[PDB]
Amino acid sequence: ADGVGSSSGNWHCDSTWLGDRVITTSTRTWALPTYNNHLYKQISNGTSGGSTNDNTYFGYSTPWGYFDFNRFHCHFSPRDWQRLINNNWGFRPKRLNFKLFNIQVKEVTQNEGTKTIANNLTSTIQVFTDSEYQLPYVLGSAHQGCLPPFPADVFMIPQYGYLTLNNGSQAVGRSSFYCLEYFPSQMLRTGNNFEFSYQFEDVPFHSSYAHSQSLDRLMNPLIDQYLYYLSRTQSTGGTAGTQQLLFSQAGPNNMSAQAKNWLPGPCYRQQRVSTTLSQNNNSNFAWTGATKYHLNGRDSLVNPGVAMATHKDDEERFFPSSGVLMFGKQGAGKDNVDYSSVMLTSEEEIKTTNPVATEQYGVVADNLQQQNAAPIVGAVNSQGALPGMVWQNRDVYLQGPIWAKIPHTDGNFHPSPLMGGFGLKHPPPQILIKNTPVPADPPTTFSQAKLASFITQYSTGQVSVEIEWELQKENSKRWNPEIQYTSNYYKSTNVDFAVNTDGTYSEPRPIGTRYLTRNL
């Protein structure tokens, strides 16, 4: 059986492409510190400080840590991603499998200036998975702390905390406080290992492709319609303008006037920003000119927002202020970092079905005309969903979030995450882990107070997560060649998606999933 001298598992990273299933397994090495000196702590931010009313919060920061595998590049190598996005229309997860193994718990002490570290063989850790969804589910907010993209990186496990209802910095009566030690957990020593399995609930395949037809152009270019439209309301060419109702059949000449069975997806406008600096207005409109939503007296910037085409044809320089997912390049600052450091994603492929983010949805009439009163047409900046309306969801990326938890609520509309992903009602249960506190020597005379002196301690180990995927094979009679994701053919100082001289891994650009085409 297991013991201090026999390893708890084996390293696995691999991808098994079998028919329609691709099974991706991965493994990393982690280190879990001691957070908050084994304490839960109230954390809050009020408007009495320098903070504003939108930035207030109230919540708790627990000593527990948690594993987050929720980004795609955790599970896919750039070459396995290329096989996926080039050769397949859609993919969805089926089941996953998860393991902790090879647990090394280490005590570390300080004598003057020297440091020394040593195994503690009797120490434990605590691991439970929240499979009844009874805790604040904090995954899916696109926080840092995921497994690294690159299998040779060692990563620090992030601290678990949660937010609760507040009023200002103060808490209200509905505010919940959760004690994570109040669950059953599994205590593991260095010989022990951990495992669980999970099976995804049925979800629509992520549709990875671009339509080969725009929504308005579904017509036959050759044949006229038998339907009529109102072409001309005035007498044409005569010495008088006497109004006369003239009708016409729309056809290849006027295709903007044809009747159509469907409408574009819903529009919620964004502000337009140009990459060229000279064009943008001179002021700071980033927050002020932003598109926000007002909930309970707190203005919240709308990010990334509803899926909407980034820009129209032959304008690549304009992008919606809050609209696009923005990834930073390797080694980029957290605050006020210049444009060249971030990587702006763009949705070109949904221009067909979805309206441009920075432009109006359309035009409606504002008034009832009269012989005296001219007709007036207003702009529709924000448009909810109407019957006969189709749209595309936002695209997933190699760097972006895999799924999200659909909040438990009375109703939702198209419960698909706005960052892109797979909306799940019962998402993969978040896994929590902590170093079991080991006390320093108590006094020899009894004391009621809790023990405030602990041994400085941390643990390390190996974690493996294996997700089975369901692929939708591309079956198409298109004659000409597709567009594929290909690496740059020309020479470069170093390979892309590979280490540099110093060993720093880097991902040069965001890679979306839609290179294939279908008919709209």
Place this chain on the structure above:
Amino acid sequence: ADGVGSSSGNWHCDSTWLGDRVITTSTRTWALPTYNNHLYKQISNGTSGGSTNDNTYFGYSTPWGYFDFNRFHCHFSPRDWQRLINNNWGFRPKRLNFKLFNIQ
């Protein structure tokens, strides 16, 4: 079997409300020092000192320690206490179960 590298048990805190039975489990981490340098000692207080006649005693202080779970809040969370006292007229214990494990 058990050894230096395999843990002796798992953490359990939970409350199972089932019909008329509620089963409350709990777990804590403790530290047991060395009392009296491994000695029994006579202890006493007389009235010959500043003490009065009511406060006199005679007894022994052993090196042994002891577990006391005898308060309610050891076994109940304020929310599990609210389910109890709001929804039920009476309650009595039936049986208990006790474990030490993971000894360092």
Place this chain on the structure above:
Amino acid sequence: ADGVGSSSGNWHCDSTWLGDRVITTSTRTWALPTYNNHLYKQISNGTSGGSTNDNTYFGYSTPWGYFDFNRFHCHFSPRDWQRLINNNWGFRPKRLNFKLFNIQ
């Protein structure tokens, strides 16, 4: 069998809280008059009177009456409502049963 001198049913008001099911029964005493002297009648309101255009209607008023149990407090006592809303997240009806009896 039934007749003029034997009652058609028994009074029932009660609430049976059993596991996940709560079964609420209720009983009332009613009186049904003669409406419209046994007549259907056209009723309407036009804008030619003092009424406005939004308040116009056209319809019929029948001699028939109808039972409406469609409010919650018909079926729940304030104490049975407190057991519901305090101790449970969600509730939905499953089936109902309805009786007229003791007709005078």
Place this chain on the structure above:
Amino acid sequence: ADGVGSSSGNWHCDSTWLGDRVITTSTRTWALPTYNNHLYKQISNGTSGGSTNDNTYFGYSTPWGYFDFNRFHCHFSPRDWQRLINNNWGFRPKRLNFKLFNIQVKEVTQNEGTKTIANNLTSTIQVFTDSEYQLPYVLGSAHQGCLPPFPADVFMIPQYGYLTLNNGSQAVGRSSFYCLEYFPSQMLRTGNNFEFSYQFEDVPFHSSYAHSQSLDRLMNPLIDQYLYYLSRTQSTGGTAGTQQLLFSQAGPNNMSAQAKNWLPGPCYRQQRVSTTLSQNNNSNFAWTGATKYHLNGRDSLVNPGVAMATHKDDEERFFPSSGVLMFGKQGAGKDNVDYSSVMLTSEEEIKTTNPVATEQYGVVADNLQQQNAAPIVGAVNSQGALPGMVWQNRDVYLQGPIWAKIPHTDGNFHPSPLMGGFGLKHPPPQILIKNTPVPADPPTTFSQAKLASFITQYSTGQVSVEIEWELQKENSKRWNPEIQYTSNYYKSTNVDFAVNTDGTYSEPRPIGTRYLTRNL
């Protein structure tokens, strides 16, 4: 089957004396009116009026009525009572059986000055028995409204109401309100009948007998004791009084000094009142000089009190103020009625084991003696229960209550009712009855308000209750004759326990149950 023209049951009054079982059945005719016009009503009394702080209450008066059979003479004829109390030591109920039948519901209306009454054959009544004990249990307070003693009397069913926690006339948050229509009840028309059965929980036989030995006299009159007592602390007869401890054996000469294994029952003193007017003090001490108990700021007279001998030997004129059960003679007023109208019961038979009500329990020392300080002895007026203490319960009467409900509580001491009776934890379930309201003609145009106009209506019928009893036969070797209950041999204007010229039944005297003797 049953109908309007066939009767629902037969009349039964009888007593079956069989071995150790006596089975007493009874039947009466009742009339149940319409109380409160079919309304529950808050009732209260505050101290803001003429009322005092002790007399405040808060509660509700329901339209429902209730059957009370809880007095003995409901179930026993004076001759059946004589067979019981003369020939048997103890008796307890076993089971009962209860029936309503022959239900006549009648409407009554007023035209000018004339009155007219008529059957309503379709009308119902509602009857439930509260067998889960979920209502205020109001039986056992010795209220009026029981079945009449005499089978030929027709009695009016009393109104049901209950009291709840108050503060002043106002109600507190724990105050309960009960709606009796919220139970399942059985609705009966004129053809229907009602029945239920009930089985008494095991109870100690009521001990009906007087002890033939006093508690202190259990000794042998012939033989001395081997034990010694302190007879004399001083030198006797000498020229000096030098204290010397002398001991002696108690015997036939001094039996007050003997050692004894037991003590008398507990004592809570009462004030002594003489029937002779010249002896009593001149003032009104009835309430002021009373023995009361103070509960939640309300002084409550202690009535009848703990069982204690009414008076000692050769004093029949003194009685404890609140101590004795007091029955009124036939046709006596409710308020300030003269002495000759009430019938005072007396406990002679418990003088043996129990202390006299109007006298102290005993004497204890108040101080530690010294050669300087004389010994001081105080009186014990109220004495709780000590180990090695025996007593008798108060006696039941032909007119008095049969049982009581032992309140549901964490603890009780000797849960036997202080009025006398059988304390039951699950007493016979109180039976509630009401006339189902029948509306007067509603208006022809709908109205939200509840229907305030009803048909004036009442019902009548026949009720039967049959109780099986368990007797403890008297088995005794006493040579000489007992004392028996015998009617007056001498002539009189009319028979006792029988009608007078005008048809008025009367019971001339209270009849206790203890004429037999046992050895203490």
